[PDB]
Design a protein around this ligand. Structure first.
Ligand SMILES: *[C@@H]1O[C@H](CO)[C@@H](O)[C@H](O)[C@H]1NC(C)=O
Ligand SMILES: *[C@@H]1O[C@H](CO)[C@@H](O)[C@H](O)[C@H]1NC(C)=O
Ligand SMILES: *[C@@H]1O[C@H](CO)[C@@H](O)[C@H](O)[C@H]1NC(C)=O
Ligand SMILES: *[C@@H]1O[C@H](CO)[C@@H](O)[C@H](O)[C@H]1NC(C)=O
Ligand SMILES: *[C@@H]1O[C@H](CO)[C@@H](O)[C@H](O)[C@H]1NC(C)=O
Ligand SMILES: *[C@@H]1O[C@H](CO)[C@@H](O)[C@H](O)[C@H]1NC(C)=O
Lengths: 49, 44, 50, 198, 238, 88, 50, 50
């Protein structure tokens, strides 16, 4: 209340000081069920372009 | 405070009517309230 | 499609096809699981002040 | 704390002054809040792009500043034209306006000068020392129905008097205070007693 | 079309002739006037960015603009409450209706508060609150309730003074005017049966008092017809 | 509470005038054992008005009453030089 | 990419509070009108024409 | 650190080993001179509207 008033003395009443809340607890990452590799690296290396 | 707010280009303008001029008026309002009542409001 | 949310359940049936629906504001409101294929609805927690 | 109305004239002044001196300490994505430190380091070409971000934050802040005074000083003159209506009517005359001239029966009003404000002193009347009485809407005397020319037909129980609406001052019911109209036939609550002739 | 301006009536003035009414009509009419909006608050840095800190780091280069916008919306939110207080905290006491309901035939029961419903509104206030609704958009379908759209810091505050509170206020208003007349507004309440109070309101419009006693049944039926037509007009889609 | 949960304030049942507004008719004050108490407010003093159809009440005295009322007059006249505020 | 979205969103906030304060002014003026109209129409019998 | 303004003596209580003193607006209202270490009130000149 002192900082949101920018005053060392805080007067009587209702004061909306903190506008905060909201909180991370865990972490879900869902990627699809894919396990195969693919030719994304072997289209650079060699001869016939 | 006032020289810090002066030195950024901001001014504070003085009134034309000072507070004594206001107190000259509010005395003279109350003087006709006692002596003339209300009759000075609608005319002489 | 990342962010912070509270993931609830879903019972009112659109059509078959695409991944996401999104709101009037264009942010996503309900999102596809890419493996199990149901919908988690994104609600937050603790928006607002003190 | 009745000057806290007028303190918030000073407060909503001085908050917005102390806001806009601190928005010069904002930098708006430039390297510096203060002007000449940009000018002491960089050539206009590339000092130009920092001061491009700087003045557009600065012009945004100052137009914002005026806009809250524009809503406030409109509300101030709306309060002032309210207040000048009191000095036209409550102060200058004796008005019939119920609680525009303060709570109670308004007698006169007095101005007292404050900084940025006038204290009004609504001198009003509040009645006191109340007492139950039995009333009648009309009294017929010789069959003809009499009604009061002013005031109310009142009784203590022993006697049927008349006093005014505002105040207990009982009078013997004469011809001179009461007008006769019609005969006592359509009146509910008629009282049959005398009417005095002087 | 060019607008028809009004009905023409060249009234026959004469220099010694004059018009005086021999009857009248008691009429009630309806004014509707707003008071104060939805109490609404918006967070800065949830609306402008979902949980980003470098959002706030770039925002503080601009500084704290939206904090004075929070000062602006809380100034809005306090003028909601003082506008509500200045239209309903104009009395001191709470005046209570008598159960014996003789009014000289003036059936008040449409504008009396209803104890049968737990909402203690009048019947026309129940029709009125059923008329104006929040069925306009999907925003207010769950910003009328407490579950809430997700909208990022945008919040709706409930008011301090609720509907049954101001219903109790206007019941106390209608009770104090209906029993004391106007005499409670200057101080203490001073009770008065209706004939002298309404007859001095005929003296307040500058005719006499006896014509009430002559025509009191006619103005009773004119009153009950007049409160019939306004709840039919509220029952209409006006 | 209907405006959300409050903590640190004592819930009491008794109705008083509203010192500090909270919301939904609930108000707050500082009770003297000193504690912040939270209460549904009082709307005012209940006056059962004793109506008669044939009787009135009449005052026999008075209290003349000066009441004080405060209205503002003017805003404080501030102005800037515009470019000097931008760039001295 | 961030700051243009920042300035558009904050500029939406200054546009919103200017239309909200002028709604506050007009419904404030109607509330003042309502207070005076109830205080003299309701709590007394005004002689003022219409 | 450049600029314009008048130089007066501060003759006031000053923080011992930085040269600058600052206001609310973070401009140098007081400087200490690097040659002789004496605290000088750099304020801008007499200006105004006309
Ligand atoms: C790139 O290398 C891999 C293994 O080294 C080989 O299988 C592949 O054929 C090469 N790509 C091409 C285009 O020859
Ligand atoms: C793998 O993913 C596909 C499509 O995303 C889905 O239809 C299938 O059921 C998934 N299989 C398992 C075992 O999750
Ligand atoms: C007042 O009420 C009593 C009880 O009902 C009744 O007998 C009397 O006639 C009424 N008087 C008037 C004037 O209405
Ligand atoms: C009305 O006008 C006629 C025509 O001049 C005149 O003779 C008459 O006296 C007037 N009556 C009054 C009451 O002025
Ligand atoms: C408050 O109300 C509840 C239920 O009405 C009651 O059980 C409790 O004793 C009350 N407390 C006080 C202090 O009146
Ligand atoms: C150089 O600086 C020192 C430190 O204040 C001072 O004592 C000395 O007089 C200066 N010399 C000249 C030539 O200015």
């Amino acid at each position: 209340t002192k900082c949101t008033l920018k005053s060392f003395t805080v007067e009587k009443g209702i004061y909306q000081t903190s506008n905060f809340r909201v909180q991370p607890t865990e972490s879900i990452v869902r990627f699809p069920n894919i396990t195969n590799l693919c030719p994304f690296g072997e289209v650079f290396n060699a001869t016939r372009f | 405070l006032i020289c810090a707010q002066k030195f950024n280009g901001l001014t504070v303008l003085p009134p034309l009517l000072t507070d004594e001029m206001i107190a000259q008026y509010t005395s003279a309002l109350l003087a006709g309230t006692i002596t003339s009542g209300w009759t000075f409001g609608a005319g002489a | 499609l990342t962010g912070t949310g509270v993931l609830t359940e879903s019972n009112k049936k659109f059509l078959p096809f695409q991944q996401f629906g999104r709101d009037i504001a264009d942010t996503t409101d309900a999102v596809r699981d890419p493996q199990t294929l149901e919908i988690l609805d994104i609600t937050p927690c603790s928006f607002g002040g003190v | 704390s009745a000057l806290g109305k007028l303190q918030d004239v000073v407060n909503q002044n001085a908050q917005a002054l102390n806001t806009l001196v601190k928005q010069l300490s904002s930098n708006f994505g430039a390297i510096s809040s203060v002007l000449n430190d940009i000018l002491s380091r960089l050539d206009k070409v590339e000092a130009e792009v920092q001061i491009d971000r700087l003045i557009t934050g600065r012009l945004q802040s100052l137009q914002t500043y005026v806009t809250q005074q524009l809503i406030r000083a409109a509300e101030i003159r709306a309060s002032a034209n309210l207040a000048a209506t009191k000095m036209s009517e409550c102060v200058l005359g004796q008005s019939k306006r119920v609680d525009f001239c303060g709570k109670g029966y308004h007698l006169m009003s007095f101005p007292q000068s404050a900084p940025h404000g006038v204290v009004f002193l609504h001198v009003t009347y509040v009645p006191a020392q109340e007492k139950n009485f039995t009333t009648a809407p009309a009294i017929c005397h010789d069959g003809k129905a009499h009604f009061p020319r002013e005031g109310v037909f009142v009784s203590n129980g022993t006697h049927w008097f008349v006093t005014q609406r505002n105040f207990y001052e009982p009078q013997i019911i004469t011809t001179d205070n009461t007008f006769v109209s019609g005969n006592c036939d359509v009146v509910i609550g008629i009282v049959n007693n005398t009417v005095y002739d002087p | 079309y060019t607008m028809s301006l009004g009905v023409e009536n060249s009234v026959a003035y004469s220099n010694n002739s004059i018009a005086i009414p021999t009857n009248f009509t008691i009429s009630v009419t309806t004014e509707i006037l707003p008071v104060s909006m939805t109490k609404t608050s918006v967070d800065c840095t949830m609306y402008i960015c979902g949980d980003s800190t470098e959002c706030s780091n770039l925002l503080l280069q601009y500084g704290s603009f939206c904090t004075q916008l929070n000062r602006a919306l809380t100034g809005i939110a306090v003028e909601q409450d003082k506008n509500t207080q200045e239209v309903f905290a104009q009395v001191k006491q709470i005046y209570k209706t008598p159960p014996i309901k003789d009014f000289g035939g003036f059936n008040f029961s449409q504008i009396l508060p209803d104890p049968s419903k737990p909402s203690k509104r009048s019947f026309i206030e129940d029709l009125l609150f059923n008329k104006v609704t929040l069925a306009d958009a999907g925003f207010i379908k769950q910003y009328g309730d407490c579950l809430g759209d997700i909208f990022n810091g945008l919040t709706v505050l409930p008011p301090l003074l609720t509907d049954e509170m101001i219903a109790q206020y206007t019941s106390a208003l209608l009770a104090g005017t209906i029993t004391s007349g106007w005499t409670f507004g200057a101080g203490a309440a001073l009770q008065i049966p209706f004939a002298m109070q309404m007859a001095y309101r005929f003296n307040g419009i500058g005719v006499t008092q006896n014509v009430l006693y002559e025509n009191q049944k006619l103005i009773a039926n004119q009153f009950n017809s007049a409160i019939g037509k306004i709840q039919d007009s509220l029952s209409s889609t006006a | 509470t209907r405006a959300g949960c409050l903590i640190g304030a004592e819930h009491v049942n008794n109705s008083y005038e509203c010192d500090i507004p909270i919301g939904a008719g609930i108000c707050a004050s500082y009770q003297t054992s000193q504690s912040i108490i939270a209460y549904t407010m009082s709307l005012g003093v209940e006056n059962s008005v004793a109506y008669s159809n044939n009787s009135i009440a009449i005052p026999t005295n008075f209290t003349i009453s000066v009441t004080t009322e405060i209205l503002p007059v003017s805003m404080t006249k501030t102005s800037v030089d515009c470019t000097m505020y931008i760039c001295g």
